[PDB]
Amino acid sequence: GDRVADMIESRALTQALPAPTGQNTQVSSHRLDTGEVPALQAA
Amino acid sequence: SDRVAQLTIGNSTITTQEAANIIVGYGEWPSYCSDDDATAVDKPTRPDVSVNRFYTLDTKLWEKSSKGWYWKFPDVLTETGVFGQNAQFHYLYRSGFCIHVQCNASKFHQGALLVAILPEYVIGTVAGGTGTEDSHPPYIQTQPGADGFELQHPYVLDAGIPISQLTVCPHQWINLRTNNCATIIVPYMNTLPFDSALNHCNFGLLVVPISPLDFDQGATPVIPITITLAPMCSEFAGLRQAVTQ
Numbered sequence: 474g475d476r477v478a479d480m481i482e483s484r485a486l487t488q489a490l491p492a493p494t495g496q497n498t499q500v501s502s503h504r505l506d507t508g509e510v511p512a513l514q515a516a
Numbered sequence: 517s518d519r520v521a522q523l524t525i526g527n528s529t530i531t532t533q534e535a536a537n538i539i540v541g542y543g544e545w546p547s548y549c550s551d552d553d554a555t556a557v558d559k560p561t562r563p564d565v566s567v568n569r570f571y572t573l574d575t576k577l578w579e580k581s582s583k584g585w586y587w588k589f590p591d592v593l594t595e596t597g598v599f600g601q602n603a604q605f606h607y608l609y610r611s612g613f614c615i616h617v618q619c620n621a622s623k624f625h626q627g628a629l630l631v632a633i634l635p636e637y638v639i640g641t642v643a644g645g646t647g648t649e650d651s652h653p654p655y656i657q658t659q660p661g662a663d664g665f666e667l668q669h670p671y672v673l674d675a676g677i678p679i680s681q682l683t684v685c686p687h688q689w690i691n692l693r694t695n696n697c698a699t700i701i702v703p704y705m706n707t708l709p710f711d712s713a714l715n716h717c718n719f720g721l722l723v724v725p726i727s728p729l730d731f732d733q734g735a736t737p738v739i740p741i742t743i744t745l746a747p748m749c750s751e752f753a754g755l756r757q758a759v760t761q
């Protein structure tokens with residue numbers, strides 16, 4: 474019993490994945506690449 | 517078809533035309549570490565030619581009253597060549613070995629040797645003689661290097677184990693009426709898949725004359741024993757600066 478639109482319009486970010494063992498280490502090679510840097514983080 | 521052989525690996529080959537046969541230690545060849553077994557997460561180096569060579573190390577003269585010798589592997593090759601340079605830079609290490617010991621003599625000399633392997637050949641002492649003082653062996657009896665070391669009491673192999681049942685471990689005989697060399701191919705035996713090359717010595721090469729040398733006077737009295745070994749399927753990991761010991 475209202476005509477207002479204010480009242481009629483009036484949650485986790487993380488998913489628990491199953492992890493029985495520690496994760497594997499896939500094969501990497503060298504990389505000589507600008508633009509993207511995986512070391513420099515922002516603490 | 518068995519007396520004559522040729523072992524080429526790396527850039528070095530050895531020919532033999534009075535061999536016995538090649539025995540493969542515990543029935544399997546040396547191989548690389550699978551990804552089911554490896555725990556180190558850095559990519560190993562595998563030189564594949566420069567370290568898989570027959571390194572001829574030393575020459576022991578065998579007279580009529582010898583006892584026996586032993587060489588701790590791989591500490592015979594941590595002072596030699598590109599194996600000795602990669603094993604001093606890298607912390608981890610694994611390899612097999614193709615071990616070839618030559619001892620030629622005429623068709624009038626006699627005598628037999630028991631060149632045998634045994635893994636984790638730990639060395640005891642004489643315990644102060646009477647057996648009451650806990651004496652530990654020195655570093656040179658423990659790890660003699662490429663110079664080798666002569667057994668004091670070869671009946672008990674300096675470890676309280678008899679040489680009469682050394683023949684369980686991978687071995688073959690050099691009796692001078694039949695053969696002149698003895699190839700023993702040894703895989704990598706250790707619990708953990710890589711280990712340090714400077715601390716842990718995986719096995720020892722016991723070379724003991726059981727039946728003594730004998731020859732009438734007039735023949736050549738100098739009968740040498742030279743051992744040549746080849747690290748097969750060697751790989752290293754964990755690069756840092758050079759340690760020597």
Ligand SMILES: *[C@@H]1O[C@H](CO)[C@@H](O[C@@H]2O[C@H](CO)[C@@H](O[C@@H]3O[C@H](CO[C@H]4O[C@H](CO[C@H]5O[C@H](CO)[C@@H](O)[C@H](O)[C@@H]5O[C@H]5O[C@H](CO)[C@@H](O)[C@H](O)[C@@H]5O)[C@@H](O)[C@H](O[C@H]5O[C@H](CO)[C@@H](O)[C@H](O)[C@@H]5O[C@H]5O[C@H](CO)[C@@H](O)[C@H](O)[C@@H]5O)[C@@H]4O)[C@@H](O)[C@H](O[C@H]4O[C@H](CO)[C@@H](O)[C@H](O)[C@@H]4O[C@H]4O[C@H](CO)[C@@H](O)[C@H](O)[C@@H]4O[C@H]4O[C@H](CO)[C@@H](O)[C@H](O)[C@@H]4O)[C@@H]3O)[C@H](O)[C@H]2NC(C)=O)[C@H](O)[C@H]1NC(C)=O
Pocket residue numbers: 579581582583
């Ligand atoms: C002071 O004082 C002091 C005191 O005296 C002194 O001291 C001294 O010193 C000196 C110097 O050094 C001396 O002398 C010397 O000596 C030496 C030693 O001897 C000893 O030893 C031996 C050993 O043996 C061994 O081997 C054998 C074989 O060979 C065997 O058999 C045995 O068994 C043994 O084995 C062992 O060991 C080994 C090692 O390697 C091991 O491996 C194993 O395992 C085992 O264990 C011995 O033998 C001897 O013995 C003797 O004695 C006895 C008694 O008991 C008898 O029985 C015997 O027989 C003997 O005797 C003999 O011999 C000797 C020689 O040896 C003579 O001399 C006599 O006479 C008789 O004949 C002993 O114990 C030595 O070696 C030396 O020698 C050398 O030199 C000389 C001069 O100098 C001459 O003459 C000779 O000939 C020789 O030469 C040679 O060598 C060299 C080096 O090595 C070379 O290089 C050359 O080349 C030559 O070679 C040649 O020849 C030969 C023949 O011989 C032939 O074979 C080859 O092939 C070639 O050709 C010297 O003499 C001393 O000793 C000391 N002392 C004492 C007491 O000892 C000091 O000096 C002072 N100071 C000053 C300053 O002066």
